[PDB]
From a paper:
A high‐resolution crystal structure of α1‐antitrypsin complexed with the lead compound GSK716 was generated by soaking compound into apo α1‐antitrypsin crystals. The structure reveals that interaction with the compound induces the formation of a cryptic binding site that is not evident in apo structures, at the top of β‐sheet A behind strand 5. This region is referred to as the “breach” as it is the point at which the reactive centre loop first inserts during protease inhibition, and includes the site of the Z (Glu342Lys) mutation. The structure reveals that the 2‐oxindole ring of GSK716 stacks with the side chain of Trp194 whilst the carbonyl group forms a hydrogen bond with the mainchain Trp194. Trp194 adopts a new position due to rearrangement of residues Gly192 to Thr203 consistent with the change in intrinsic tryptophan fluorescence induced by binding. The phenyl ring and the propyl chain occupy two highly hydrophobic pockets. Hydrogen bonds are formed between the GSK716 hydroxyl group and the Leu291 backbone, the amide nitrogen hydrogen and the backbone carbonyl oxygen of Pro289, and between the amide carbonyl and the Tyr 244 hydroxyl group. This causes displacement of residues Thr339 to Ser 359 of strand 5A relative to the apoprotein. The co‐crystal structure with α1‐antitrypsin demonstrates that the small molecule ameliorates the effect of the Glu342Lys (Z) mutation by: (i) optimisation of hydrophobic packing in the breach region; (ii) formation of hydrogen bonds with buried polar atoms; and (iii) displacement of the backbone at the top of strand 5A into a configuration less compatible with partial loop insertion. GSK716 stabilises the partially folded α1‐antitrypsin or the fully folded but labile aberrant native form. This mode of action is compatible with the lack of binding of GSK716 to polymers, in which partial or complete insertion of the reactive centre loop completes a β‐hairpin turn and so occludes the compound binding site.
Ninety‐five per cent of severe deficiency results from the “Z” allele (Glu342Lys) that perturbs the folding of α1‐antitrypsin resulting in the secretion of only 15% of the mature protein. The Z mutation lies at the head of strand 5 of β‐sheet A of α1‐antitrypsin. It perturbs the local environment, allowing population of an unstable intermediate that we have termed M* in which β‐sheet A opens and the upper part of helix F unwinds. Polymerisation from this state involves insertion of the RCL into β‐sheet A with a domain‐swap of the C‐terminal region providing the inter‐subunit linkage.
Numbering used by the authors: 22 to 341, 357 to 393
Write the structure that this text describes.
């Protein structure tokens, strides 16, 4: 069916998406609800009281309704699915915890992080800010075989604790077809901005429909690693309407539909990245205490004060009847979700507005 925590991850995806889209309506959006929520659920194991409750509530878990055991069990099961060989061929995810080597660390936290969340904790010398930044970036670069470079650009001089969360997905259509060369085609960013994109033209039976509720074309395509992308192409002037009207229930209904129709598609071959300061973005969702001097991280270190000084997310996606069917060109801004098929968990959510930006 679906993972217990999938509805929570869906609400977290919409909360974070709508925050980013409200900030700027001219900006690309690309993040992993799954990888950010996993990292902060893992971090919550080392926190207590208001610091702890703020993190899980900020991930859209109602702690009056869902027991904390079912939350961690949900994530462990989700990670079990994501760590299967078929998934691992397309999907790399990692969480690096970097802690000042002068700290006495609680063994229980280091056990739970490594055991339950398959995450890595390192001691680093934050006395040397430039070397610590290099060590963090080397760990991410090595984890992604050179794909993610110089992830952390700045560390505060008083940094004692940094968290880096990364996800790398190699996108390749599951279904083989009559492969042509891409052709360079216009992508209408806005009324006065056009950029060339490589466009794959396909005529076939697609899981595609027009939605009166979303005022959008809705296309579902399958990728290796048990992933389904839902692409929402809004009608002229309806992108904000589409963003406003999306719900988990609506997305579930699209994922359940297997009906196809004949369509001529123009599909841009787009690689996309998103980099986020999680202290900034999660702060706006109400996660603030863990990043403040007040932070209760007594689960990480018993003796000394501790706060999370730095939290960075990076998401990377790379691509490896005889009657006139509809012609649908993804040649203008579109919204998307990528779902993991077993759990129905939102691996990615975002919006392409400028393919070159
Ligand atoms: C509207 C389609 C965008 C999509 N394109 C393709 O998947 C594509 C296009 C041409 C050739 C080709 C592919 C896959 C393959 O194997 N060959 C992709 O760029 C994308 C954008 C944002 C989010 C996201 F999840 C994904 C998958």
């Amino acid at each position: 069916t679906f993972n217990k925590i999938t509805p929570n991850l869906a609400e977290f995806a919409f909360s974070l998406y709508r925050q980013l889209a409200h900030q700027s309506n001219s900006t690309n959006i690309f993040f992993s609800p799954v990888s950010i929520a996993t990292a902060f659920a893992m971090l919550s194991l080392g926190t207590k009281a208001d610091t702890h409750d703020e993190i899980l509530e900020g991930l859209n878990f109602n702690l009056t309704e869902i027991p904390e055991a079912q939350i961690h069990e949900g994530f462990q099961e989700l990670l079990r699915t994501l760590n299967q060989p078929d998934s691992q061929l397309q999907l790399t995810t990692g969480n690096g915890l970097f802690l000042s080597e002068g700290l006495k660390l609680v063994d229980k936290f280091l056990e739970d992080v490594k055991k339950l969340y398959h995450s890595e904790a390192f001691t680093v010398n934050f006395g040397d800010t430039e070397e610590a930044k290099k060590q963090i970036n080397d760990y991410v670069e090595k984890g992604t075989q050179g794909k993610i470079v110089d992830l952390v650009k700045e560390l505060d001089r008083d940094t004692v604790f940094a968290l880096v969360n990364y996800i790398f997905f190699k996108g390749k259509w599951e279904r083989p077809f009559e492969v042509k060369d891409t052709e360079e085609e216009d992508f209408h960013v806005d009324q006065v901005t056009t950029v060339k994109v490589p466009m794959m033209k396909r005529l076939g039976m697609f899981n595609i429909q027009h939605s009166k509720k979303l005022s959008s074309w809705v296309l579902l395509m399958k990728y290796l690693g048990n992933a389904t992308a839902i692409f929402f192409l809004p009608d002229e002037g309806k992108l904000q309407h589409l963003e406003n009207e999306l719900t988990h229930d609506i997305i579930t209904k699209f994922l359940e539909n297997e009906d196809r129709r004949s369509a001529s598609l123009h599909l841009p071959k787009l690689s996309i990245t998103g980099t986020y300061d999680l202290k900034s973005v999660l702060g706006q969702l109400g996660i603030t205490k863990v990043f403040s001097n007040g932070a209760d991280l007594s689960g990480v270190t018993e003796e000394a004060p501790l706060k999370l000084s730095k939290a960075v997310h990076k998401a990377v996606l790379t691509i490896d009847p005889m009657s006139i069917p509809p012609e649908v060109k993804f040649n203008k801004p579109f919204v998307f979700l990528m779902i993991e098929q077993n759990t129905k968990s939102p691996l990615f959510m975002g919006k392409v507005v400028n393919p070159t930006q």
